[PDB]
Amino acid sequence: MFRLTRLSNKPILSPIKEHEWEKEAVFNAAVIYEGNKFHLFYRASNNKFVLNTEKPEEKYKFVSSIGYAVSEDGINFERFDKPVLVGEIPQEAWGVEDPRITKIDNKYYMLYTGFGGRDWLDFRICMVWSDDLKNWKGHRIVLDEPNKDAALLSEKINGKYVLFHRRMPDIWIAYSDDLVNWYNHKIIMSPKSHTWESKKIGIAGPPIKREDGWLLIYHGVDNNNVYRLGVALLDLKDPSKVIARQKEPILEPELDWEINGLVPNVVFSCGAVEVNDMYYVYYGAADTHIGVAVIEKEKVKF
Amino acid sequence: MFRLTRLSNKPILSPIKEHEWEKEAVFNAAVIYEGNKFHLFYRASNNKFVLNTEKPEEKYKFVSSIGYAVSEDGINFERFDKPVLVGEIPQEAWGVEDPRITKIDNKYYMLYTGFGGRDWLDFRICMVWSDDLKNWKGHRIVLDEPNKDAALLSEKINGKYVLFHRRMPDIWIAYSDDLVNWYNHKIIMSPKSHTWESKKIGIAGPPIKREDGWLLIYHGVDNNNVYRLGVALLDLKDPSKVIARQKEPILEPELDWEINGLVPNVVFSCGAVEVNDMYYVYYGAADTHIGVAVIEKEKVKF
Amino acid sequence: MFRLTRLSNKPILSPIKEHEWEKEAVFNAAVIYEGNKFHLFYRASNNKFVLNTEKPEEKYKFVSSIGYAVSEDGINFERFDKPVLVGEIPQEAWGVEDPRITKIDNKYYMLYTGFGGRDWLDFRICMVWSDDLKNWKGHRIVLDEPNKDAALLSEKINGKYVLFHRRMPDIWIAYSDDLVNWYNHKIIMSPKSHTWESKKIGIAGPPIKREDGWLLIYHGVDNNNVYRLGVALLDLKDPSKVIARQKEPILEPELDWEINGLVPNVVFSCGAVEVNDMYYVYYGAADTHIGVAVIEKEKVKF
């Protein structure tokens, strides 16, 4: 059984009170390693999260934005004054959440949750893409249904694009010829009763290719709404088949800024990259800050 | 083994965005061949099908109606801008679905699913009848239980009306003296685990009378919710006894508009008629379009 | 993966119309092999089972009794005029169900479900004992809570009696010093989502001692209320730990008297016994008849 090791006992990205769009939270960040640089696309909130009302109410409205940060060493980031993606469309009125970025061939796809705020189910997986991590376009609703925790596989399987998603409460897979229409939906992984991952599970970042299969980091929620990270291995040629799944989590809330925050007891990753024979796992903590934790690639054994 | 053969590589009926009632889907259609015309009674939806919520949600409400279309060659159909049947009671709040029409004693009986939208089990087999295929009367809930995939046999057995239905996950038969009270319910056919028909099965159109028995076209659902068509044969004098059943399907999603659509990976028939020594099988495709495949009845061998 | 083989394609015990206490059903039987004889203690009902009313209705009352039958060969049984256990009104007003018999030392313990009919939760685990399988005494409510699927282990563990029971929906274990007060309650096994055993599980007959552990046959229920038998292996010294569990069922409704009957789609065992290196598993079929199925002990591999 292996676990992640935090690189720092302090957050590496925190909210910035002077910036409305990221005044209260930065968290759940996609990550791409390119040109010897860590590219973080982090969710940002202008407000705490009141979630216990019948419907989303203007008086408690929060807006998610996606900011960008970049780092050479993985620890110190250059940040920017404005977000790089905002919800401009009515179905994205309360913003854009939890991006996952996958490079397929020479294009980058960011899958995120657009939240329209018209009711608590007013969310959907959206996609934008770029060829430069800078000019995002091609917006589309990936599945026209309440769904989230979505990521593209970094390559095609038998000539088809592969989508991981999350019809409650399982991790699902789907296939597409054209990145518009999805078919061959299949459950690939389910929660487990009387465990830390009993309530629901969802993919973390997009799966990382290995020789022995696809490394699928995921998040699991217990009955107290504690979010932890677990890890599984998908079959290399049929990523719809799980060939190994670790029983214990690889990361759990332990530090004060993972236990305490806007949403207690959360570690949540939307991205991880392989660098120098190590896996770098960036994670939102308490839906308030971003941490980073690593595992030596050699220790990943099931 | 035998299989149906599509007549067209493109739909024969498709939605009409200009008509609210059939804006998004036309599928799962009853057919009766009278007066050397194909009379098609098709399900039509005003909206897409969000099915993954905990309950049916008003924000994602779809309403099914039954539309009428007529053809001389079974391929080209004339259509009309208003439907022939819509929901008239609260049990049909979300419309009327998947009609199966049977003629018994010069009365036409249409059995369909009334969906109230109050929860995902809020559906009922309902029945209307008419002298003329035009003026439907006598709406009634057939069984007061969550049930569907219903069809009447075109003849009485020992003076009794014969009903096929689908208490999950099997095809049931039941008997009635009066079309009101059903009794001697029993299971006549079951799914086969670890096959394309592992999850559930349901009758397709009403069985077609043959000299060697009743042709029972049915749909089977696999573990990933793929809907395909299969074929069984019922004893001629006792339609509760399955005397043959083909191992392999006779129709499965192959064309892109059967694989892709509002509900991927679906072929589904509510209707089939014998015409010029051929069986014409009309099917919904991806719950979005209607197609039609055939087999020469000489080729139906078990 | 291994499977039970039916000794007969016909029931070995069936209702006897001229005996009111068993005129409609005989099923779910305890069994004990002693004196080189199969002693069968079967549940019997005087009526069909209306189970879908808001409360148990007098006009649909069924009463369960325990009948006795004896066999030399495991297949051909001698039966008797009167039941050997009935309910003492009112806590068992609708009778005594699903006995599991365990021999501990030189006493025989029958654990059964007492059903009072006052509401659909009005059932509890009850126990009687005898030293001769004939004079049952010492009646008690084992757990004063709605619970069932109970059996005693045939030996003490570290001095303690060992109870299997079923707080919905898991197989539980517990311990006692006096066969009256139970403690150290623990879940030992759980249903598995998206499987034949997804809704709930419960112990079948009491576990059978092996060299490699305790054989725990159980029943699992899918989302369509189909009951199938499965099998697990408990640790020999600590039978609260499951050390193996076959994924596939070992017995499923297949024959027509197992698929159709008073309750469709049911095979259910309350008893199994080892005779000449063969496990004989008695099972109720559709809550209506009793079958028997066997497995060579050699073929029990996990």
Place this chain on the structure above:
Amino acid sequence: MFRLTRLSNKPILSPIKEHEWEKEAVFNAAVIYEGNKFHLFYRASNNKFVLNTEKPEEKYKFVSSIGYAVSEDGINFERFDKPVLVGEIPQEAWGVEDPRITKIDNKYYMLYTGFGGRDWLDFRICMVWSDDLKNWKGHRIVLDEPNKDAALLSEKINGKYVLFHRRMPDIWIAYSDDLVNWYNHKIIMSPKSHTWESKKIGIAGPPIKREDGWLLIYHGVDNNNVYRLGVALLDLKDPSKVIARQKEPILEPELDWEINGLVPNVVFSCGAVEVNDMYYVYYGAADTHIGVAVIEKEKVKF
């Protein structure tokens, strides 16, 4: 490591079957030492505890009351005919549970769990107060949320009242100016996976002031729902900081009347006082009786 020592091998308080309100259980008692007398405010139940129903069922309704008992030696208590507090019908329909009493500036604050019985989360922290331990008044709901295991600190911190509570599964602190509105909610202590305190923790009695900090006895719950007592030390000037915490429990079910009872395997304290340089820790045993255990003040070492 240090541990409590039971004063006696028998309960210091038991139910009285002839008194409906305390017929089945006396347990989880608040305690205050005043006038050289132990004042014990005990939870009492008219009924056993069926807890395994999907919802609270009126057929298994239990009603908790608060009784008063008084002692000079802390062992032999005088009791009274009638409870001192009952649940007001219907907001506290199933009674008033687990009181903790804190004295602040010559007033006594009793925080208890009001249980309305309408679902298993239909409970909240309620507070009454008095200046004489007799005339309780000022009832109010402390937090408008499902919450319990609540106690006030016996003095203000930087002019603020201090509230300990338990949003599942952690111990929380909060602050108030008015004993009405609480702010700056923070988790201060969490369970520990794979230990005796892995499922959840909650405060026991109100923290006891020491020279080296605030003694926080708490209960911990393992994955089989066994209840044990642990201890931590809070920073004297900032009770939100835990400066020490003992790995092993200080009390656990051991005696038969702690292991067996209405809820097996429970020791649970709502009160502890310091008398003559000794901590007297009163505890519910198996939710059925009250015991007392002690430790010399000087043996509290971390």
